[PDB]
């Protein structure tokens with residue numbers, strides 16, 4: 001039986017209580033041969049009629065309209081509580097059990113597919129997780145808080161980033177999920193305008209079946225007779241519907257809450273709602289009471305409100321009708337040996353009703369994060385070098401790891417927020433940091449390497465940490481506020497990195513802020529915090545990322561300029577030029593200024609008191625000092641500037657291009 005475009009649209013559209021862009025659906029039906037419809041679930045085991053039958057009804061509607069239906073089985077979350085693949089294998093069995101019930105329940109599987117998050121995520125780690133982070137990177141945390149159900153949220157701002165990603169991961173054309181999941185699907189449509197993909201996913205949201213008792217807008221997990229379950233006997237079915245709330249009132253559609261979920265009112269009739277969803281929503285079904293048959297749902301609704309049909313009869317009718325729908329399942333799990341076993345295995349898990357901390361490191365291990373900056377201050381770089389040398393000496397059998405945060409920083413929206421730009425920045429500034437004297441003992445590892453190296457475990461701990469900490473708690477690390485949701489993730493990742501690298505100490509710079517203190521907090525004061533030593537090379541303007549502070553990517557021409565504009569009045573014993581000299585003096589052990597004889601003559605200083613004497617009250621002219629310092633900076637940066645014009649010249653093109661994009665906006 002061939003269906004024209006109009007008939008296909010009617011059938012498909014009839015799945016949704018709402019359809020975000022009927023025009024977009026219509027256009028999809030006209031243009032596209034295999035439309036991806038998508039839905040998803042975590043296996044629970046106790047399957048209720050809305051999930052058992054109603055889903056089957058709607059899926060069958062999509063596949064008849066010429067769609068393909070991909071179910072996203074969210075089993076990856078079993079890796080959370082896992083002890084040697086234990087919980088995962090159970091959840092996959094529950095998973096297979098649900099599928100078998102659907103088969104028996106009458107879902108046409110010819111164009112239906114089941115994907116398992118555990119298989120598909122881990123197999124496509126990069127593609128998957130980078131998007132998850134990108135959706136977070138480009139979204140205010142307020143916008144993502146809206147997607148979850150005062151502030152008790154605790155990294156439940158992560159699951160929506162994942163759920164949203166799934167839609168694009170699977171290339172879903174239609175998001176055929178419940179109306180309760182409306183808000184995430186919206187966020188999908190929004191994210192579509194961010195990633196340039198031209199066609200937004202059509203949100204075809206199905207009806208939330210009502211609870212059987214009064215004051216229930218939805219099925220309840222506390223109340224096992226709030227809805228019919230698939231394992232319920234025909235005696236159970238009779239009992240539950242007989243006691244069910246049943247107002248004699250003509251049912252009208254509820255107002256569309258932007259918060260997807262339904263609301264419980266007194267004139268909401270679940271006996272009638274069932275007839276509409278599990279009976280009349282089937283292709284050519286109709287109810288029969290006392291000889292007469294009602295072709296429309298409306299016909300039955302009238303006959304009930306006119307009192308042509310009794311509440312006794314109406315329920316008796318549903319009871320037989322619902323039992324008719326379950327019997328094929330009941331029969332199948334009796335006859336079929338393999339199916340019966342599936343159920344018996346699922347049943348056995350029910351007798352448990354009503355994670356360990358990672359091992360410390362044997363020997364010291366320091367960790368440090370390269371700042372995700374276009375231009376890194378020399379003051380900060382020298383602080384990092386000293387803290388490394390100070391750690392390696394103080395713990396000579398220990399190790400130091402510098403982590404280039406090429407995943408974290410893109411999540412945080414540092415620099416331009418582009419992978420290539422942040423990779424280049426981290427790669428360039430790292431090479432230069434080594435050119436200024438970073439020890440060779442330091443292990444340089446990227447997050448890309450660390451995360452992919454042991455990917456499954458990594459994200460488990462990111463979430464595991466996420467579950468144990470409140471959202472507001474993580475926002476305290478950024479001073480009470482985050483710029484986007486990605487900053488929340490970046491925080492979690494750093495602790496996750498610390499733990500996987502098995503680190504004893506976390507080195508923080510002034511740029512890292514309180515973010516690294518999280519690792520200390522989470523490990524119960526086990527990981528010690530070492531702070532960097534800064535405030536030695538100051539800004540070159542007079543007292544009162546600009547262009548009066550020395551960066552570690554300054555070339556020979558840049559250094560000459562910045563020194564030239566440095567503030568220094570004559571007969572002065574405290575100014576930027578003095579502070580830099582005393583630092584160079586201290587590091588070196590002497591500061592030799594060269595002069596014409598009778599211009600003062602040549603002189604050295606090996607103490608700060610001696611130098612300040614000749615400046616404030618003496619013959620050390622400002623100009624003489626600055627000519628001495630400028631040479632010393634050029635000499636100490638000879639190795640680094642050689643890299644700028646040679647090895648890093650390729651990447652320096654990418655950074656100056658990034659810099660101009662930032663100045664534009």
Ligand SMILES: O=c1c(O)c(-c2ccc(O)c(O)c2)oc2cc(O)ccc12
Pocket residue numbers: 039040041042072074162163164166167176177178179180181
């Ligand atoms: O764990 C998931 C889940 O429970 C639901 C869901 C919840 C209520 C609904 O009414 C519905 O249609 C889907 O979606 C998902 C979509 C994903 O990409 C991943 C996981 C879930």
